Design a protein around this ligand. Structure first.
Ligand SMILES: [Mg+2]
Ligand SMILES: [Mg+2]
Ligand SMILES: [Mg+2]
Ligand SMILES: [Mg+2]
Ligand SMILES: [Mg+2]
Ligand SMILES: [Mg+2]
Ligand SMILES: [Mg+2]
Ligand SMILES: [Mg+2]
Ligand SMILES: [Mg+2]
Ligand SMILES: [Mg+2]
Ligand SMILES: [Mg+2]
Ligand SMILES: [Mg+2]
Ligand SMILES: [Mg+2]
Ligand SMILES: [Mg+2]
Ligand SMILES: [Mg+2]
Ligand SMILES: [Mg+2]
Ligand SMILES: [Mg+2]
Ligand SMILES: [Mg+2]
Ligand SMILES: [Mg+2]
Ligand SMILES: [Mg+2]
Ligand SMILES: [Mg+2]
Ligand SMILES: [Mg+2]
Ligand SMILES: [Mg+2]
Ligand SMILES: [Mg+2]
Ligand SMILES: [Mg+2]
Ligand SMILES: [Mg+2]
Ligand SMILES: [Mg+2]
Ligand SMILES: [Mg+2]
Ligand SMILES: [Mg+2]
Ligand SMILES: [Mg+2]
Ligand SMILES: [Mg+2]
Ligand SMILES: [Mg+2]
Ligand SMILES: [Mg+2]
Ligand SMILES: [Mg+2]
Ligand SMILES: [Mg+2]
Ligand SMILES: [Zn+2]
Lengths: 59, 105, 50, 134, 86, 122
RNA sequence: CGACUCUUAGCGGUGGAUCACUCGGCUCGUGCGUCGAUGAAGAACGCAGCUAGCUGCGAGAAUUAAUGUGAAUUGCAGGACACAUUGAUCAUCGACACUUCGAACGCACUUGCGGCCCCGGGUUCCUCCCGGGGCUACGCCUGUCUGAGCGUCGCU
RNA sequence: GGUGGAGCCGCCGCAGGUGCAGAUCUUGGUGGUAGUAGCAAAUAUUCAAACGAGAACUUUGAAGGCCGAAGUGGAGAAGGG
RNA sequence: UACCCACCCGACCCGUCUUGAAACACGGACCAAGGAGUCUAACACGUGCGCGAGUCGGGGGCUCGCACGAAAGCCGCCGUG
RNA sequence: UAAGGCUAAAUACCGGCACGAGACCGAUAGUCAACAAGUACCGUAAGGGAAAGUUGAAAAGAACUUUGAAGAGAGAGUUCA
RNA sequence: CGCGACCUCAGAUCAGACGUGGCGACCCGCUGAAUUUAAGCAUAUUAGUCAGCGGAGGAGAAGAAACUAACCAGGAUUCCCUCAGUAACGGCGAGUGAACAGGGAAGAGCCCAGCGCCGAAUCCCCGCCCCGCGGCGGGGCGCGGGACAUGUGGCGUACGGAA
């Protein structure tokens, strides 16, 4: 994900959980050069990312 | 370096004049700013002497201006309790009041 | 530097996006006088304002 | 001679009031006269040109007598495009050629709620002054 | 060796970015800016290089509040009122 | 289909917050379509929705501050957001009562000796 | 007529003079005389479907509502719209909104640490923990409260 | 005469920032020098193939070589971005 | 007369400071555009014009929103000076 | 008549908002800036600080054929040019 | 060895306000050179100027005589013409250098303290209602506070005033 630069890891987890009706194992943030904050969001083992990716339209 | 019979010519430009030179290109436009005020004041107090209140007859001080007569600053107090005009009232009927004139004659 | 502050990293983020060329359709707008970017930088010559 | 100070009459100042003029003003400037027939019926000399008015070209290389309909208005290029007013490019792909409204005559207005109150209040103003001088 | 040889051991920096100026002027050892003067409360303008003065005065920025103060006054400084509705 | 400020002005506070959250959702997937190719039709809606959100959020703040400045209408002590904001010089000016106030010695003088109207040389 | 060299002319380059233009200056007048702790000037960082710069703006971000205006916008798309519609666009601007620094204000400038209140999750105040809102700078005035003094006393 | 494509001069008066060869003058341009000085610090390259419009200079293979672990090797600081 | 060429006679490179410069004195490769006795005040004499024992001129005033005007005209102001 | 205090008007304005004008300059001139100019760029920093306007009326900005790896050409075409 | 007044003096994230910074052409306090001139120079001059510093306003400052004058006298301040490059200053050199009167623009005057008189006749902030509310005020009602007798309000201020 690209995520607003002011976001916490707790904040990112509570939003990804709020939108895509998902649940998060752990959140890994970085800040790309160009200053947009990437956020690799690891979904719980019971949840599949190749599926929720289709709902959000990415693939 | 003087040459052959001039004057002595102490001219005052040593200080710095170029900076504080006051040119008068306002001059003809100021003639007009005042003219409107002069008119706008007369139209504001419509029935009233446009020139202003009445000033007294007065003689000029020094012996060179002995024989002239001026319009003074205001009618004196001693003058007023002869004509029977209260000093605070005259200020309201266009009579300049000068509480500062020693009458000697 | 590889040990950067946050203010320093933001500064490079903005200077790194101003670098790209001009979009080619800009050259098509009505009242143009612009041909090439002329405000580009190259890390070997004209080091950053640092 | 102009008299009113608070108007400019300055060679470069109202050339600047032109090519920096906003689109809201540029409507009035892009106005074109009406044909003798309408100019009789409405008592309106001229009108801002509109998108789908009919028009005759009067000057220019291909002034003529054919009545085309306006297609668009390059208010940025400050010149209009007309119906069969067009040339052929190098690839055969035809383009319109701009025509200034001042060099064109309107032959059939495109009427509207907005345009009608304009034609009335233009005519009412024209005969108010003729009644004032009378 | 005072040149081309000493111009080599120049790694560390004296100045950095000032948080008030925006200029690369802040002295790290001295902890004052030196173009505006940072920890000092007043800006270091000078009557003494007018060319530097006109580089940053009112109008050279955005005036993103003052530019609408000139707008309100021109019209009357009214507030708390809305034009007549349709 | 523009969500005009006509229909929203007379509506419920909590109701707008749904339509706002509705657009807030749509804007999020149009940002997704911008990444995954999308269409030139979609990529225009991202400007429509961005504006149509402010069309709604405007009505919320307007109706709120038009309500909040009904509360303190009458009370002496009201917050800094609603006190009139003219100019630091202008709010510290005298009160419009405290420059037309006249010292009582002044009014007694303004009675006995008012300015006449009078013309002369007649 | 060998080549080279020189002078002149015809043409061709190189170069940008001259000339003609000019949304710019300079000068002189005129009217007004308008900042900021309800947070200025200035700075940073963001914001366009394709956008780097200038400009315009502030997470409601190439504008918001409103009022005039009345059919465009335009480099290309793309579009809503019904152009019998606040109605596209522009102008005005008086409703609303105002990222981070900055007199800048919880302490510090790393962008770090806190405290105090509240409201969500957590709790079922159980304290964290997580999220959200309001305060917490210096100086000084008037008043208010709590005080201190073998200061002056009074009553004891 | 020519090219050039939008303005211009004669006379009577008025006003100037009014006439250039030069100031190691200022700015811009261009020569002669001249296709000249030069492309010489650390021993070294060669064969075949590939790619290609085009190969002394790329790439692969083969051969000869040097740096020789106080390195021309493997990782960092500041600095660069 | 001006283009090229020919001949006879003449003929040293300009600017400058200098008693004296073709100088073994200095500036100058070449070509374009720019480039230096100005304005103000104060005297002095000469000259032109108005009036003349007087004569003004300023500041004011009276007449405009200037188009030409921020002009012109007028004022016991004109003599306070 | 001091040792205490208040006050409109004529008066000043190379900053600011909004205007008007000129015996002014006209792209090496006029402000440093007619243009993305206090920008590019230099300096650690205080500071320094440029160059650069004009196709045509309308892009009608050279389709197509051809030679060439391509840059460039030859024809053709657009144009009042 | 306590409780209570007052006087001093503290602490409040106490109720309510307000100050800082910017601009800086013009304006007001202070600070304050040296090039330069004098054919050297130190006094002088440049010059109460540049820079420095503080503070404002739409104008500022000044302003209602501890004035001018010597007259048959004028009458706040500011500006313009004038005085006049004059009185005076000065290695009396270089150079500096005002005012008064007169004409005009404008024209406006006023308050305190004190001395006294008046039952503090006064002011502030609270709480309820009436009107008004985008320059927060007026009207009334409250043993709701507090300031004030170490002095608030009315008359009164030298032109005279009170009685
Ligand atoms: Mg008078
Ligand atoms: Mg380098
Ligand atoms: Mg009294
Ligand atoms: Mg030739
Ligand atoms: Mg030629
Ligand atoms: Mg040039
Ligand atoms: Mg005690
Ligand atoms: Mg032409
Ligand atoms: Mg000239
Ligand atoms: Mg020349
Ligand atoms: Mg060896
Ligand atoms: Mg490596
Ligand atoms: Mg000699
Ligand atoms: Mg010799
Ligand atoms: Mg010499
Ligand atoms: Mg006094
Ligand atoms: Mg040029
Ligand atoms: Mg030119
Ligand atoms: Mg220039
Ligand atoms: Mg050219
Ligand atoms: Mg040219
Ligand atoms: Mg031609
Ligand atoms: Mg201040
Ligand atoms: Mg000397
Ligand atoms: Mg000398
Ligand atoms: Mg000397
Ligand atoms: Mg001295
Ligand atoms: Mg002095
Ligand atoms: Mg100074
Ligand atoms: Mg004052
Ligand atoms: Mg005063
Ligand atoms: Mg006097
Ligand atoms: Mg004399
Ligand atoms: Mg002196
Ligand atoms: Mg008393
Ligand atoms: Zn700074």
């Amino acid at each position: 994900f690209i995520v607003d630069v002011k976001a916490n890891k707790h904040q990112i987890k509570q939003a990804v959980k709020k939108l895509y009706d998902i649940d998060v194992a752990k959140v890994n943030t970085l800040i790309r050069p160009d200053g947009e904050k990437k956020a690799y969001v690891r979904l719980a083992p019971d949840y599949d990312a190749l599926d929720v990716a289709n709902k959000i339209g990415i693939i | 370096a003087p040459s052959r019979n001039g004057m002595i010519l102490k001219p005052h430009f040593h200080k710095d004049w170029q900076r504080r030179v006051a040119t008068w290109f306002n001059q003809p436009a100021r003639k007009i700013r005042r003219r409107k005020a002069r008119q706008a004041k007369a139209r504001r107090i419509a029935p009233r002497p446009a020139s202003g209140p009445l000033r007294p007859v007065v003689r000029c001080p020094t012996v060179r201006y002995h024989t002239k007569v001026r319009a003074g600053r205001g009618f004196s107090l001693e003058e007023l309790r002869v004509a029977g005009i209260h000093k605070k009232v005259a200020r309201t009927i266009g009579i300049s009041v000068d509480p500062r004139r020693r009458n000697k004659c | 530097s590889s040990h950067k502050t946050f203010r320093i990293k933001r500064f490079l983020a903005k200077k790194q996006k101003q670098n790209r060329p001009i979009p080619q359709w800009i050259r098509m707008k009505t009242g143009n006088k612009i041909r090439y970017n002329s405000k580009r930088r190259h890390w070997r010559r004209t080091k950053l304002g640092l | 001679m102009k008299f009113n100070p608070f108007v400019t009459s300055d060679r470069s100042k109202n050339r600047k009031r032109h090519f920096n003029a906003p689109s809201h003003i540029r409507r009035k400037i892009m106005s074109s006269p009406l044909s003798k027939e309408l100019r009789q019926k409405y008592n309106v000399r001229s009108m801002p040109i509109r998108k789908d008015d009919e028009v005759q070209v009067v000057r220019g290389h291909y002034k003529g007598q054919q009545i085309g309909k306006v297609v668009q208005v390059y208010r940025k290029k400050y010149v209009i495009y007309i119906e069969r007013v067009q040339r052929e490019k190098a690839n055969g792909t035809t383009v319109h050629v701009g025509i200034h409204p001042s060099k064109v005559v309107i032959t059939r207005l495109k009427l509207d709620k907005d345009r009608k109150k304009i034609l009335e209040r233009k005519a009412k103003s024209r005969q108010v002054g003729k009644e004032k001088g009378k | 060796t005072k040149g081309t040889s000493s111009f080599g051991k120049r790694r560390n920096k004296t100045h950095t970015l000032c948080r008030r100026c925006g200029s690369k002027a802040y002295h790290l050892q001295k902890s004052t800016c030196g173009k505006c003067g940072y920890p000092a409360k007043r800006k270091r303008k000078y009557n003494w290089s007018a060319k530097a003065k006109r580089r940053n005065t009112t109008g050279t920025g955005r005036m993103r509040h003052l530019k609408i103060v000139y707008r309100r006054f021109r019209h009357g400084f009214r507030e708390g009122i809305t034009p007549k509705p349709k | 289909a523009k969500i005009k400020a006509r229909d929203l002005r007379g509506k419920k506070k909590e109701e707008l917050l749904k339509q706002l959250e509705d657009l807030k959702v749509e804007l999020s997937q149009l940002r997704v379509a911008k990444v995954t190719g999308g269409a030139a039709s979609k990529l225009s809606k991202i400007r429509v929705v961005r504006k149509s959100i402010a069309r709604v959020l405007t009505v919320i703040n307007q109706t709120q501050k038009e309500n909040l400045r009904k509360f303190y209408k009458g009370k002496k002590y009201k917050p800094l957001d609603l006190r009139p904001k003219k100019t630091r010089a202008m709010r510290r000016r005298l009160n419009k009562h405290e420059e037309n106030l006249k010292t009582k010695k002044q009014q007694r003088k303004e009675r006995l000796y008012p300015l006449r109207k009078f013309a002369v040389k007649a």
